[PDB]
Amino acid sequence: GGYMLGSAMSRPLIHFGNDYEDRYYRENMYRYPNQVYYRPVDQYNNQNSFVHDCVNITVKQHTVTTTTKGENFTETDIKIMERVVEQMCITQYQQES
Ligand SMILES: [Cl-]
Ligand code: NA
Ligand code: NA
């Protein structure tokens, strides 16, 4: 029946340990989501399980929306996107709980 779609937020500040990824996130920040998709929080007993699904669903949605427009993500984009989305999913879980 579809998923819950969180409110847009400022893309998070993340100090990536890989220096090149750290720079790449800043250079290309607008490529990544600023909103997450999820199943309702009360369907989970813990944060980690929620976040796991929230990351998978959000990355799936974002990649599908992008590919159908004839655009592409790099391998670096995917690594950064997963981290960005994980942080926003954690935020969403803590906020919505
Ligand atoms: Cl932003
Ligand atoms: Na480093
Ligand atoms: Na594509």
Author numbering: 126 to 222
Paste lines from the article:
Pathogenesis in prion disease involves refolding of the host protein, PrP, from the monomeric, primarily α-helical cellular form (PrPC) to a β-sheet enriched, aggregated infectious form (PrPSc). Additionally we found that rabbits, a species with low susceptibility to prion disease possess PrP with a helix-capping motif in the β2−α2 loop, which appears to hamper the formation of the β-state. In the previously determined structure of wild-type rabbit PrPC 121–230, the sidechain of S174 forms a hydrogen bond with the backbone of N171 and vice versa, creating a hydrophobic staple helix cap motif. To test this hypothesis, we introduced the single mutations S170N and S174N as well as the double mutation S170N/S174N into rabbit PrPC 121–230, successively changing the rabbit sequence in the β2−α2 loop to that of wild-type hamster PrPC.
The structures of the S170N, S174N and S170N/S174N mutants of rabbit PrPC 121–230 were solved by x-ray crystallography to resolutions of 1.4 Å, 1.6 Å and 1.5 Å, respectively. In wild-type rabbit PrP, the side chain carbonyl oxygen of N171 hydrogen bonds to the backbone amide of S174 and the side chain hydroxyl of S174 interacts with the backbone carbonyl oxygen of N171. These reciprocal interactions, flanked by the hydrophobic interactions of Y169 and F175, form the basis for the hydrophobic staple helix-cap. The electron density surrounding the N170 sidechain is fairly weak suggesting it may be disordered. The sidechain amide and backbone carbonyl of N171 can hydrogen bond with the sidechain hydroxyl oxygen and backbone amide of S174, respectively. The S170N single mutation reduced the rabbit PrPC ΔG of unfolding to 5.9 kJ/mol, while the S174N change and the S170N/S174N double mutant displayed ΔGs of 5.45 and 5.7 kJ/mol, respectively. At pH 5.0, no β-state forms in the S170N mutant, whereas the S174N rabbit PrP begins to form the β-state to a maximum of 12.6% and the S170N/S174N double mutant forms a maximum of 37%. At pH 4.5, the S170N and S174N single mutants form 54% and 66.6% β-state and the double mutant sees a larger increase to 84.9% β-state. Under conditions that promote β-state formation, amino acid changes in the S170N, S174N and S170N/S174N mutants of rabbit PrPC cause successive increases in the population of the β-state at equilibrium, whereas the reverse mutations in hamster PrP (N170S, N174S and N170S/N174S) cause successive decreases in β-state population.
